[PDB]
Amino acid sequence: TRPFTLPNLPLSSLSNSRAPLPISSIGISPDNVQSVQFQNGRCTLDGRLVGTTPVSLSHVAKIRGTSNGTVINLTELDGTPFHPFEGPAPIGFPDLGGCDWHINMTQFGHSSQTQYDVDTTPDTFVPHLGSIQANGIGSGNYVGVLSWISPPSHPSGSQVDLWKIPNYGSSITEATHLAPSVYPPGFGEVLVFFMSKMPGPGAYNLPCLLPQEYISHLASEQAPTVGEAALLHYVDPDTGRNLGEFKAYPDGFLTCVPSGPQQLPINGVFVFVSWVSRFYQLKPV
Amino acid sequence: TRPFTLPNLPLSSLSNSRAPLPISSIGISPDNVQSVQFQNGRCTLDGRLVGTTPVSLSHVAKIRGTSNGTVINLTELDGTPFHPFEGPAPIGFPDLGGCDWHINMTQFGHSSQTQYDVDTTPDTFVPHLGSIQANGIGSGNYVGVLSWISPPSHPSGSQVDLWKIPNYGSSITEATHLAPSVYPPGFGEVLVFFMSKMPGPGAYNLPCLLPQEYISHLASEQAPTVGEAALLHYVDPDTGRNLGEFKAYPDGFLTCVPNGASSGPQQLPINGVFVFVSWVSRFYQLKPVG
Amino acid sequence: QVQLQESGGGLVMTGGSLRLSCAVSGRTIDVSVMAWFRQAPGKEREFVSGMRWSGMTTYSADSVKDRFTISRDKTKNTVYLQMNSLKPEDTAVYYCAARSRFIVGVPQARDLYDYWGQGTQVTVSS
Amino acid sequence: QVQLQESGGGLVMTGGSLRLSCAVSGRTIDVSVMAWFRQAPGKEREFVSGMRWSGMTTYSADSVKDRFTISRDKTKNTVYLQMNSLKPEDTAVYYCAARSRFIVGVPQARDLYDYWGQGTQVTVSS
Ligand SMILES: C[C@@H]1O[C@@H](O[C@H]2[C@H](O[C@H]3[C@H](O)[C@@H](O)[C@@H](O)O[C@@H]3CO)O[C@H](CO)[C@H](O)[C@@H]2O)[C@@H](O)[C@H](O)[C@@H]1O
Ligand SMILES: C[C@@H]1O[C@@H](O[C@H]2[C@H](O[C@H]3[C@H](O)[C@@H](O)[C@@H](O)O[C@@H]3CO)O[C@H](CO)[C@H](O)[C@@H]2O)[C@@H](O)[C@H](O)[C@@H]1O
Ligand code: NA
Ligand code: NA
């Protein structure tokens, strides 16, 4: 009954879903990236949240827990216990692989902020089991938000690669109940990513599959997915012209057939046109 | 006409509109606060953004500008020039009066973060003119987000008071084109606020008039405001019971008749959902919540 | 993602009792409704009993309301269906189902549920 | 909040020209459409001309399309209505109007605009 819609808002006004950052461009992945498995920014077209994805940007790329000086025992952001062997990490936990994190740590009831430096590669980084190394953070309860990133401490000399997710599990046990991987569908279609500039010592661009405001929209609307794919137009608000057709798939991602989507202006609006076959052939952007 | 709606989402899942914080309670103000003039979190029921309010939480309580070691010359968050003598401050600029701010400053293309300490009371704090004191922040371009707060440096010994907005102007000129004040219009009504816990050396609770996700909903839907006030139910998702009736007014705020700070809207659970019922008179007489 | 695993079905005499159980795993933080459905031969899947996962309220279909009880284990993330006074008309495959998307109350429409178990056979012979 | 202040109205002879101006101040960053309306005695208010504030598209009503031009100043936040070949039927109060809420194109419905000027009288005498 409820018709499918996307927010009537320009893309440049919206936020990344893997960090609290404005969207600055549309991107596609490099050819060496064959799938993505982001845990944040994952929402079906009928509004079902996947992975660690929250409803609200106020939970995105944040951590909460108590340090004992050796580990941080993680909780949900509101303090609720997070049990091991169930999911990758608490809701909203950062999912940027291929980098070191620098998380700004503050406290309810105390002054000051502390930079928490997170290498996600050691065997002590086990959010799936509810704990990560304290790396010098003194004992106490903290709330943290991702502030900036840098190249990974290991392997030595590797570059930032935000197409990856961190290693949530350990050598003993793999993390379970992750959001599944997303793959390019075929027919010359490529996945469409919404990009944000991320602070740190390089020209870092963070990709995500859906703007956060789309997620809270879908989670509220919960429109039945009555077709195999949603044909969309990206509309220029000045002229009203269709800048390109896209398909949104039920699992919660967009594609186009690509000079291509990366050169599109970011001031447009995605508009639902109609339900089509999953094998509907798009006109190249 | 597109019917008016509010998001079909529980309050506990939403964000404050004056800082990027989860909502933790519903509150009313102390009795000495009868109106407020927040500049963020301001959106009409037909989706018009007012004050410094952005569409997205990714812009809320942030600054962008270039320090020369003496002042930070502000821009909009995307780097767009901010023109002086026009509005209180750039879009998204923090609007917490009655406290010192501690803003986490980072840079595109450089390592590290820096805590920027903001006393909003001196004449060097003039965001209406595009300039605020650097207070030790070295030369460079920065983006900053509010991270924690503390009692104001001036007046000496004053307490945190988040019902206020800062002084955007100075002795040179008063700030212009602020979002106007809001007050409860109906009989026995008080303003209703969505509260968040704010880090810092006290038990700070930050009030706002609308969750940020309501704002992006309204800005998108743009439902015509065809009545004087929107009658709402706060609905318990477990039982479906109406926990209390509220009115939302066209300027973008809610009221209730409390029947008490110790027994009223503040004791409502935060896992409920606001649901539109019908358009009613500006003077519809609400039943006391508690 | 939420995983559901039922157990406890089998053959029961008319008038007897049976307790089904369903182990819930994965992203349970925002599971709001757990329910049991049943599917008889040549029939559609039908609501039996449902509960607010983190609340206290339950609701059962009229055909079972005075005989069936749904409950959540106090120690583990397991939901139970206590079936009393079973009759041949209760024979079906019973399914455990989870709802995570926000909703008020306990929905009975099969299409509104988000996750499903594999089912367990219950056969009531007289 | 957006403030609009018109100027430039007055008396003009038939066939003459007049340029109205409207100063836009306040929150202009996300003003998307500026327009001119006019209201003659005993008639409803009517759309005259509109432009995408930061874009290139404009639209004029058919009754003025070949005689009136809307434009934005290159230096200041001022919108102009250049009125040529004026006729007595152009006599009206002319209003400046702003749209800030997101929209595609140039709307003509008065109820879609968000901010209004106080109006300026234009009188065309024969
Ligand atoms: C500035 C520090 O950044 C993080 O450490 C990162 C580390 O930074 C090193 C610099 O690159 C180097 O020029 C010199 O300044 O020493 C720094 C400390 O080792 O670089 C590695 C990769 O080589 C990682 O990227 C580290 O995260 C941060 O953790 C530190 O606290 C400093 O803020
Ligand atoms: C810890 C500092 O907080 C901010 O300064 C605030 C200032 O803090 C003082 C502490 O309250 C006091 O116990 C002692 O530690 O000195 C601190 C520095 O003066 O207190 C005033 C109110 O009197 C304001 O609240 C200040 O913002 C911050 O600006 C500093 O950089 C430190 O983080
Ligand atoms: Na690991
Ligand atoms: Na000032």
Side-chain angles (χ1 to χ4, degrees), chain A residues 2-30 32-33 35-155 157-170 173 175-280 282 284-285, chain B residues 2-155 157-158 160-173 175-240 242-258 260-261 264-290, chain C residues 2 4 6-10 12 14-42 45 47-55 57-58 60-65 67-73 77-86 88 90-110 112-117 119-124, chain D residues 2-4 6-42 45 47-64 67-73 75 77-117 119-124:
Chain A
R2 167 91 61 156
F4 179 76
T5 67
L6 294 173
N8 180 43
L9 295 171
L11 281 190
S12 61
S13 75
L14 307 182
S15 174
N16 210 280
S17 50
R18 294 175 73 198
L21 295 171
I23 293 168
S24 47
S25 69
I26 298 169
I28 59 170
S29 64
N32 62 333
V33 174
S35 61
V36 297
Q37 199 179 4
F38 308 154
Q39 297 301 302
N40 285 326
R42 301 295 300 274
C43 186
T44 64
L45 295 188
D46 65 9
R48 179 174 55 94
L49 305 175
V50 200
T52 53
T53 301
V55 168
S56 171
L57 198 71
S58 62
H59 295 239
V60 168
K62 287 190 182 179
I63 66 170
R64 177 94 191 265
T66 292
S67 175
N68 60 16
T70 303
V71 303
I72 299 171
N73 274 286
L74 297 165
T75 64
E76 308 285 354
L77 297 188
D78 72 354
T80 300
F82 177 77
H83 284 184
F85 310 112
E86 293 296 341
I91 298 298
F93 190 88
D95 77 341
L96 283 61
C99 60
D100 279 7
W101 304 340
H102 309 288
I103 292 173
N104 195 32
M105 302 282 264
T106 55
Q107 299 186 281
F108 301 105
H110 301 278
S111 300
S112 310
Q113 67 178 28
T114 308
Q115 184 183 284
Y116 168 41
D117 305 320
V118 191
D119 175 3
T120 66
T121 66
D123 272 289
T124 57
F125 185 84
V126 283
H128 168 66
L129 305 189
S131 78
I132 56 185
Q133 68 274 356
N135 193 27
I137 295 293
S139 292
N141 183 265
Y142 302 83
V143 61
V145 63
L146 181 66
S147 175
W148 59 283
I149 67 176
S150 56
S153 289
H154 300 95
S158 48
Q159 303 299 323
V160 168
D161 182 357
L162 299 181
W163 303 102
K164 307 211 251 180
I165 53 162
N167 179 22
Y168 296 98
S170 75
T173 324
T176 59
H177 302 101
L178 271 67
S181 289
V182 180
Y183 303 84
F187 309 117
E189 293 177 18
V190 305
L191 298 175
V192 168
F193 298 94
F194 302 93
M195 317 293 303
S196 295
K197 299 162 53 180
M198 165 68 72
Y204 303 144
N205 285 283
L206 173 64
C208 71
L209 290 167
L210 296 173
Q212 187 63 34
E213 289 77 13
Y214 283 27
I215 293 176
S216 61
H217 178 81
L218 299 167
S220 172
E221 289 289 308
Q222 304 176 18
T225 309
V226 291
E228 298 182 348
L231 180 66
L232 317 175
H233 288 171
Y234 190 60
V235 177
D236 163 38
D238 177 355
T239 63
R241 184 170 97 268
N242 171 30
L243 299 178
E245 50 179 30
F246 292 72
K247 282 154 69 182
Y249 285 86
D251 283 350
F253 59 89
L254 274 62
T255 69
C256 76
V257 174
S259 179
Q262 306 201 118
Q263 292 72 35
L264 289 172
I266 58 162
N267 66 335
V269 56
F270 278 112
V271 184
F272 174 67
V273 181
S274 61
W275 294 104
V276 300
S277 166
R278 67 192 194 287
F279 306 121
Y280 180 94
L282 296 170
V285 170
Chain B
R2 171 180 300 256
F4 178 77
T5 65
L6 293 175
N8 179 43
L9 295 171
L11 292 185
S12 61
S13 71
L14 307 182
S15 174
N16 210 278
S17 51
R18 294 173 74 200
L21 295 170
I23 293 305
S24 46
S25 68
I26 298 170
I28 60 169
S29 68
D31 288 349
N32 62 334
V33 177
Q34 296 247 315
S35 62
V36 297
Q37 199 181 4
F38 306 156
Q39 295 301 300
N40 286 328
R42 300 295 302 274
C43 186
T44 66
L45 295 188
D46 68 9
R48 177 171 52 91
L49 303 175
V50 202
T52 50
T53 301
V55 171
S56 172
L57 197 74
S58 62
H59 295 239
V60 166
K62 289 189 180 180
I63 67 171
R64 177 95 189 259
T66 297
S67 173
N68 62 17
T70 302
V71 301
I72 298 171
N73 287 296
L74 297 167
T75 66
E76 307 282 354
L77 295 186
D78 70 354
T80 297
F82 173 74
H83 290 94
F85 314 108
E86 291 294 340
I91 299 299
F93 193 88
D95 78 340
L96 282 59
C99 59
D100 278 6
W101 304 339
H102 308 287
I103 292 177
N104 194 33
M105 303 282 262
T106 55
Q107 300 185 96
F108 301 110
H110 298 101
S111 300
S112 311
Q113 70 179 27
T114 306
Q115 183 182 284
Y116 169 41
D117 304 321
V118 189
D119 175 3
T120 66
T121 66
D123 277 315
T124 56
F125 185 82
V126 67
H128 167 67
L129 303 190
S131 173
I132 57 183
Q133 66 274 358
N135 192 26
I137 297 293
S139 293
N141 182 264
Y142 302 84
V143 58
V145 62
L146 182 65
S147 50
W148 60 282
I149 66 174
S150 55
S153 290
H154 300 93
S158 50
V160 168
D161 180 357
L162 301 179
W163 303 103
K164 307 210 252 179
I165 52 162
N167 177 19
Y168 297 90
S170 75
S171 296
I172 299 172
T173 175
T176 62
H177 302 101
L178 270 68
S181 290
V182 298
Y183 65 88
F187 307 131
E189 291 177 16
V190 303
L191 297 173
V192 168
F193 301 91
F194 302 85
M195 317 291 302
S196 296
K197 303 299 184 185
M198 166 68 73
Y204 302 142
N205 284 281
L206 173 67
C208 70
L209 291 168
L210 296 173
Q212 188 63 33
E213 290 77 13
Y214 283 28
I215 292 175
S216 61
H217 178 82
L218 299 169
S220 168
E221 289 289 309
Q222 305 178 18
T225 312
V226 291
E228 299 181 348
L231 179 66
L232 315 175
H233 288 166
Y234 190 59
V235 177
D236 164 40
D238 293 314
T239 63
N242 171 28
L243 301 178
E245 49 173 21
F246 294 73
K247 284 151 69 186
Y249 288 89
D251 283 349
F253 62 90
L254 278 66
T255 68
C256 76
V257 172
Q266 306 202 118
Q267 291 71 36
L268 289 172
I270 206 61
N271 66 333
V273 57
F274 277 112
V275 184
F276 174 67
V277 181
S278 64
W279 294 103
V280 298
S281 168
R282 179 175 185 84
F283 303 113
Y284 178 106
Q285 299 168 21
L286 293 169
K287 175 200 326 203
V289 170
Chain C
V2 170
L4 308 172
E6 307 101 327
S7 63
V12 58
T14 295
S17 283
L18 195 64
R19 178 180 91 159
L20 307 181
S21 74
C22 171
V24 192
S25 59
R27 180 179 161 151
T28 59
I29 183 57
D30 56 352
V31 166
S32 59
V33 184
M34 290 300 302
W36 290 92
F37 286 70
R38 75 182 175 182
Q39 178 171 349
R45 214 171 282 197
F47 177 91
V48 176
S49 313
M51 67 176 302
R52 299 292 303 182
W53 183 233
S54 75
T57 62
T58 67
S60 284
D62 272 33
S63 62
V64 307
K65 63 183 190 296
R67 315 180 281 120
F68 291 13
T69 296
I70 189 176
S71 63
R72 166 178 184 174
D73 198 283
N77 285 327
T78 298
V79 63
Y80 299 109
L81 184 66
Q82 182 63 49
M83 312 171 67
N84 297 327
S85 309
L86 283 159
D90 296 316
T91 297
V93 179
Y94 285 70
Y95 293 87
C96 177
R99 160 102 184 179
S100 293
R101 291 178 292 163
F102 175 75
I103 196 169
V104 175
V106 174
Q108 303 179 31
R110 82 174 84 76
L112 292 175
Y113 280 81
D114 296 318
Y115 303 96
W116 291 89
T120 182
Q121 176 71 44
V122 176
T123 300
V124 186
Chain D
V2 169
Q3 174 180 0
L4 306 173
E6 306 104 329
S7 63
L11 172 60
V12 56
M13 290 172 296
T14 294
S17 283
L18 197 63
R19 178 177 90 159
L20 308 181
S21 75
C22 170
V24 191
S25 60
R27 180 176 162 151
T28 61
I29 182 57
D30 59 352
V31 164
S32 58
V33 186
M34 291 300 300
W36 290 92
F37 287 73
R38 74 183 173 183
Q39 179 166 347
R45 207 170 283 199
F47 173 92
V48 175
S49 188
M51 65 176 302
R52 297 292 304 184
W53 181 233
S54 74
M56 67 200 66
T57 307
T58 66
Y59 180 82
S60 285
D62 275 32
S63 62
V64 307
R67 315 181 283 120
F68 291 11
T69 298
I70 190 175
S71 64
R72 165 176 183 172
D73 194 284
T75 54
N77 285 327
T78 297
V79 62
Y80 299 108
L81 186 66
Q82 182 63 50
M83 310 174 296
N84 297 324
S85 309
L86 282 158
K87 308 186 249 254
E89 45 268 45
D90 295 315
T91 297
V93 179
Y94 284 70
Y95 298 87
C96 178
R99 159 103 187 176
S100 291
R101 293 177 291 163
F102 175 75
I103 197 171
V104 175
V106 175
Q108 306 178 34
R110 79 174 282 183
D111 291 318
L112 292 174
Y113 282 78
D114 294 315
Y115 304 99
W116 289 90
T120 183
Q121 175 68 41
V122 176
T123 300
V124 186

